[PDB]
């Protein structure tokens, strides 16, 4: 039979379709699910990235600082920790179902605090003072489909693999109908909650409505990026079910950021290493070299990061970048390779803070060819003349031609005009566009300096500056020929 089209790359997973409501013939037929060999959590890829180390790498004096300042390795979050821990501990011990809403800006320790809470709760459950529970982590930005959370959570509960709809009625049956004595408490971290927001808002309603069921024993800890998300994007039902209590994670102050960086720099700052002068490898306790990172540098970086974001990721990255600048200068000075006091100074911290601030756009426009600068000058002249933010390309052509033909008496124009309109050549006729006109137009379009509308007539097509006008003016009058005229 001849097909009208073919699907030759269909990949379908082995997911059954029958939900949990039809496993057993009755409510009384369900056993205690905590004793089943597949329920409640009862990797093979870690050896694939193993190789044979046949070299000896050199770890220098600043290597331990850069490795230790990473995000992989709880001082300033102790009230939020106490709130989340006490609510979750009361919900576990009473066999209740509870929503905990946590919101905040990036890098302020939300995921870290919730993970530390569930580690202390699992340790407390290991001492047999609260009942045992299953911890499920669902990240909305780590899902392909938003409904895959239905796939994930049920797979964490039962060990079955079903399609998302059947998983959704399975979770509904499990949370409402199964009694508490046959169940185990489940703590779910929903992280990046906004990523799980759809048009129907069914996932939001289901996940927060299961926390209103008497038999559920479900604790949902939802992490948001804003506090006004349930009012702005969600309905009144979901906003009512989330609750009035909402824990806000403020951005870190510079005392808190300094405490975080000093906590990572305990045992390394004001310490001595044994450093080989032949290769460069350094050992924590041949020369005895003292390593310092100054507290004034850390406080400058902490104050800047705390005013801009209050982000622990940025504070740690600025400190690591300063140490890498110092370590690059160190390897340049001593000639070390990749096989008495060394200090991360305040100047490295200022360089790390200024390298994301130095405005390469003006430098890029300064280092362009004469035709691109002439294009930008003509466009700026038209914006000065007729006062419009969008200029037609034919007007730019005509005003470039006027700029060449009026200030001819400039010696540079007498040098450049034959190049511009004939490419320095007899037997090439005079050209309506300049040489490399489309080249510099496409080059300024690639950089994001220009916006061009989508028209097929090249003369009436409009061009707008996407960058600010003042930086284009200062780049243009940096040029000695264009500022002369």
């Amino acid at each position: 039979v001849i097909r009208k089209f073919t699907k030759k790359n269909v990949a379908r997973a082995k997911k059954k379709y029958t939900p949990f409501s039809k496993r057993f013939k009755s409510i009384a037929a369900i056993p205690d699910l905590t004793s089943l060999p597949e329920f409640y959590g009862n990797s093979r890829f870690e050896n694939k990235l193993k190789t044979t180390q046949k070299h000896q790498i050199v770890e220098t004096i600043f290597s331990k600082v850069k490795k230790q300042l990473n995000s992989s390795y709880l001082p300033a979050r102790e009230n939020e920790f106490a709130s989340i821990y006490l609510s979750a501990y009361s919900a576990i011990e009473s066999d209740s179902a509870t929503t905990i809403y946590v919101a905040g800006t990036p890098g302020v320790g939300k995921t870290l605090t919730v993970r530390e809470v569930v580690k202390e709760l699992l340790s407390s459950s290991a001492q047999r003072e609260i009942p045992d529970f299953l911890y499920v982590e669902i990240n909305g930005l780590k899902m392909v489909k938003p409904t895959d959370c239905y796939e994930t959570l049920w797979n964490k509960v039962s060990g079955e693999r079903l399609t998302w709809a059947a998983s959704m009625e399975s979770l509904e049956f499990y949370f409402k109908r199964v009694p508490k004595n046959k169940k185990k408490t489940i703590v779910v971290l929903l992280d990046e909650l906004d990523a799980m927001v759809t048009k129907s808002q069914d996932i939001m309603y289901n996940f927060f409505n299961w926390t209103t069921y008497e038999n559920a024993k479900l604790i949902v800890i939802a992490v948001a990026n804003t506090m006004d998300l349930p009012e702005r994007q969600l309905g009144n039902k979901i906003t009512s079910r989330i609750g009035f209590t909402r824990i806000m994670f403020t951005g870190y102050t510079h005392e808190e950021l300094k405490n975080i960086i000093d906590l990572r720099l305990k045992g390394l700052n004001d310490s001595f290493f044994y450093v080989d002068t032949k290769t460069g490898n350094a050992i924590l306790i041949v020369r005895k070299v003292r390593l310092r990172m100054s507290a004034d540098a850390i406080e400058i970086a902490s104050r800047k990061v705390a005013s801009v974001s209050g982000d622990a990721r940025r504070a740690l990255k600025v400190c690591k970048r300063a140490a890498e600048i110092a370590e690059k200068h160190y390897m340049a000075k001593h000639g070390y390779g990749y096989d008495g006091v060394q200090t991360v100074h305040i100047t490295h911290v200022m360089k790390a803070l200024n390298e994301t601030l130095n405005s390469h756009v003006i430098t890029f426009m300064t280092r362009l060819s004469f035709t691109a600068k002439l294009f930008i000058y003509a466009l700026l002249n038209l914006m000065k003349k007729n006062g419009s933010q969008e200029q037609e390309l034919g007007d730019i052509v005509d005003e470039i031609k006027l700029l060449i033909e009026v200030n001819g008496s400039n010696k540079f124009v007498m040098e450049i005009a034959k190049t511009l309109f004939q490419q320095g050549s007899d037997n090439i006729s005079e050209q309506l566009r300049i040489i490399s006109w489309d080249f510099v137009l496409n080059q300024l379009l690639d950089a994001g300096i220009l916006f061009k509308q989508t028209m097929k007539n090249d003369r009436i097509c409009c061009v707008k500056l996407n960058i600010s006008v003042e930086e284009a003016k200062r780049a243009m009058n940096e040029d000695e020929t264009l500022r002369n005229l």
Partner: protein, 438 residues
């Protein structure tokens, strides 16, 4: 080490093709563009180059036959696999299906799987994939050519099969969209009239001297026949170069249409005399000759539609009114001035149905119980419905049209040369209605 063939007026292009296309993948660009307008000899020069170098492995694709991007990808996979099967028949291969390529990523995967099973070859080779007419794709966007530019970077570097792309383009502006990629481009400018005439003579005199009408004519009534065919081609060129431009195809069509009529006027006096033969058949050189029932109600409704579209409603009562007034009242005065611009040159205006029926009743050809004016019965509306179905008249909307809405307006959809011949078939004086307005 490559052979440069002789093409009559494409010597620079053939030298550039010798510079860029070689069997060594190190000194060959990944992408090469041949840009020129239609009938500039891009395909001819590429065929003569690849025929004179038989050791070069070329695959030819016409994107015009593929129309969309997905059949282009599948055609690339199919044709590369078939050419590599034909080229090295003693290499065992898994036959990957072309129809499993639905993404450019899947083309990259399939080309990887095809090229990874030819590593037993001793030398690095080129495979020249020629997309003859890339911008002649019917569903083309601005983002498609970028994928083909960057395609070679996703294939392995140490492969024995290194695919090379040769592109043919027509329009300059499409090529100008990708100027910053710095792809090597050879341009084929349009010929002038002398090279067009030389190409036409050297490509068509052999076919003209052996055509059956001339062979029947010379027995009914080689070098001299070659001169006759060449003189005919030169006469066609000087008669119709202003009409055709420097188009080889249009002049070829004119030569085909006018050669047997030229042969039929050859006598024993005209054969050795070019001016006498030209005077016998001068009417073939004065006109290009490029060329190949409706109801009375529908004709008069078309005339009324044309009047409604190209005349203002305010001056209707000054033109069609003829009834004796029982009640006192002045009629329309008419227009004072004459228009500077002919309204028939511009777009037609939009009118209502009741105005069209009024003017149709005013212009339709003709006691106590007669009522000789024709009223709008079923047949008038039925002919109007056919008139819209044929789009001799049109509306503002064409899809899901509401015929009965008062907001829907109507316009005429025929030019003046059609409505003039229609009005000549019914002896209506339509030019009287436009002689005194502009």
């Amino acid at each position: 080490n490559v052979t440069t063939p002789e093409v009559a007026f494409r010597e620079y292009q053939t030298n550039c093709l010798a510079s860029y296309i070689s069997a060594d993948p190190d000194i060959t660009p990944s992408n090469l563009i041949l840009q020129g307008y239609s009938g500039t000899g891009k395909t001819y020069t590429l065929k003569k180059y690849f025929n004179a170098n038989p050791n070069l492995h070329a695959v030819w694709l016409e994107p015009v036959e593929l129309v969309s991007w997905k059949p282009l990808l599948q055609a690339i996979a199919r044709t590369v696999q078939y050419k590599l099967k034909t080229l090295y028949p003693n290499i065992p291969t898994t036959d990957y299906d072309p129809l499993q390529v639905e993404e450019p990523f899947l083309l990259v995967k399939t080309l990887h799987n095809i090229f990874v099973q030819y590593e037993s070859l001793q030398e690095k080779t080129c495979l020249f994939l020629i997309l003859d007419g890339f911008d002649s794709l019917q569903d083309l966007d601005a983002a498609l050519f970028n994928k083909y530019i960057k395609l070679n970077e996703l294939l392995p570097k140490d492969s024995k099969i290194n695919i090379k792309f040769i592109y043919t383009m027509l329009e300059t502006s499409f090529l100008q969209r990708y100027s910053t990629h710095c792809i090597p481009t050879v341009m084929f400018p349009r010929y002038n009239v002398d090279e067009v005439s030389t190409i036409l003579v050297m490509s068509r005199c052999g076919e003209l001297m052996e055509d059956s009408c001339l062979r029947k004519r010379i027995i009914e009534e080689d070098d001299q026949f070659q001169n006759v065919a060449a003189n005919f081609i030169h006469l066609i060129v000087q008669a119709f170069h202003s009409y055709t431009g420097n188009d080889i195809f249009a002049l070829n069509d004119l030569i085909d249409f006018k050669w047997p009529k030229y042969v039929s006027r050859i006598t024993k006096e005209n054969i050795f005399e070019p001016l006498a033969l030209y005077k016998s058949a001068i009417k073939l050189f004065l006109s290009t000759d490029d060329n190949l029932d409706l109801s009375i109600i529908s004709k008069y409704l078309l005339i009324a539609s044309y009047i409604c579209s190209y005349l203002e409603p305010r001056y209707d009562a000054s033109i069609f009114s003829r009834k004796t007034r029982i009640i006192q009242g002045r009629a329309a005065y008419g227009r004072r001035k004459k228009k500077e611009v002919n309204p028939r040159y511009l777009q037609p205006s939009l009118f209502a149905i009741e105005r069209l029926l009024a003017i149709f009743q005013a212009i339709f050809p003709i006691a106590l119980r007669e009522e000789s004016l024709m009223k709008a019965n079923i047949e008038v509306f039925q002919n109007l419905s056919e008139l819209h179905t044929l789009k001799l008249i049109a509306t503002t909307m064409n899809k899901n049209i509401d015929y009965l809405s008062p907001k829907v307006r109507w316009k005429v959809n025929v030019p003046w040369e059609i409505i003039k011949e229609i009005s000549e078939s019914v002896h209506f004086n339509i030019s009287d209605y436009f002689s005194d307005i502009h």
